[PDB]
Design a protein around this ligand. Structure first.
Ligand SMILES: *[C@H]1C=C(C(=O)O)C[C@@H](O)[C@@H]1O
Ligand SMILES: *[C@H]1C=C(C(=O)O)C[C@@H](O)[C@@H]1O
Ligand code: NI
Lengths: 265, 259
């Protein structure tokens, strides 16, 4: 029902997504960092400071923003970020409280928030949570694609790590719903749980993926999952600039140092 | 020579170094054909940032001449005076450069033990239970620690088989069980890590060393602190086995992961 009177590319065959000249799914894993300001002032200060860091993609964690339900405030903040970080893809992510975030919204507010984000032309990608429901997600994925906005579809488990087979199925379901980059984060209770997440990454990437995926086992115990993306198949990884946006992230500089070492011939 | 061991703390202590605690320890291999090659390598290694020095005796040309081996070991100990020295004759079947009869091999190791010049010896599990068990006891009677090793250069066995081999090594009295396997797929690397974790949590009363070889398995050489391998091999100049990275890069990752 959306009619028309940013531009990213995607190669199913090469299993890549290209957003502003960044080729996700090729070479060393790409570094994403989260900006988490409460007010417009905080968001601007963070954007200015982050410009010094070496990252590939900038994720705006909109759930940390106080005026998230004031449309004009959201847009001023996005614009401000876009004006400072002009050469990197900008990912818009409202993470719900049960998925690790800081606030909660109704399904209606959440869909409306992402649509406004997509309509703005200020962001290159949006994050859509799988638990939002198949119908709503499928429609919003289509809406994003109609405006040349890429989608990272995400799923989280903060209590435990599901069986490898179940992790693989959720990644496939996200792909089937049209996600450009399926993403999954799970919490290990044991060291074996970390290996279960990596097993699933390898299985999905090798047998079903026709696009990049992002995976992680959270907490210090799972840090290897944020470093070994190149060999096991995770196309991107999160680093902390000054504060982690999820448990287990290491500093952006140390992160780049490790990824480079592992990329070396 | 006087090394300590604590089954309670699952540690092995050689010349002030505590294997089994903190970040994994870095071992490097010294490979020289003649005694002068050994002195050259030892002089060049003297600088490097490693914790244990492994002399790969299978690279030594005069391995069957008792006096040459003693002179080579003494030369190494004259130059590298503070770090534990590990005596390893790695057989051709297990990636070594030469082959010896069982008798020559056992005698070579007893002589090394007798010299007081080495702090540890490597014994290959598949040498024979009886010969291995006797040589472990012999080493222990002279305050020499034993790394017991097994290698599989063509494939990675099931995790459970990896676990049983590490348990057998423990059963035979190895101070540090060691296993190295070759990945043919990505899953194989994870299989080696699974085995390390399972052994560590459920059976180990001492430190273990594990590795998935080749560039594909390099992550196994870097994540020992979390998964449970107590030491890892790095290359000063040339790799003593496939997958090893430079000592500088190795130390860099180990530090980043410890903090
Ligand atoms: C997704 C996952 C995160 C992580 O586990 O590092 C960080 C979070 O901000 C992203 O939305
Ligand atoms: C044991 C294992 C090695 C490795 O895989 O790095 C190197 C070799 O010299 C050791 O004896
Ligand atoms: Ni439109």
């Amino acid at each position: 029902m959306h009619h028309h009177h940013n531009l990213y590319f995607q190669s199913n065959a090469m299993k890549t997504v290209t957003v502003r000249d960044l080729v996700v799914g090729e070479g060393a894993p790409k570094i994403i960092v989260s900006l988490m300001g409460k007010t417009i002032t905080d968001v601007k200060s963070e954007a200015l400071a982050y410009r010094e860091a070496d990252f590939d993609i900038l994720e705006w964690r909109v759930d940390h923003f106080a005026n998230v339900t004031t449309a004009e405030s959201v847009l001023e903040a996005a614009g401000a970020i876009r004006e400072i970080i002009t050469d990197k893809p900008l990912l818009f992510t409202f993470r719900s409280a049960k998925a690790g975030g800081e606030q909660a919204l109704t399904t209606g507010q959440y869909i409306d928030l992402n649509r406004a984000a997509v309509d703005s032309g200020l962001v290159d990608m949006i994050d859509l949570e799988l638990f939002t429901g198949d119908d709503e997600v499928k429609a919003t994925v289509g809406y994003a694609h109609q405006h040349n906005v890429a989608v990272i579809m995400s799923n989280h488990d903060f209590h435990k790590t599901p069986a490898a087979e179940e992790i693989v199925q959720r990644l496939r379901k996200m792909q089937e719903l049209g996600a450009d980059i399926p993403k999954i984060a799970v919490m290990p209770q044991t060291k074996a749980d970390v290996l279960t997440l990596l097993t699933a990454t390898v299985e999905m990437q090798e047998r079903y993926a026709d696009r990049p995926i992002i995976t992680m086992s959270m907490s210090k115990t799972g840090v290897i999952s944020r470093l070994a993306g190149e060999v096991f198949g995770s196309a991107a990884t999160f680093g902390a600039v000054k504060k982690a946006s999820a448990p287990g992230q290491i500093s952006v500089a140390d992160l780049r140092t490790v990824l480079t070492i592992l990329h070396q011939a």
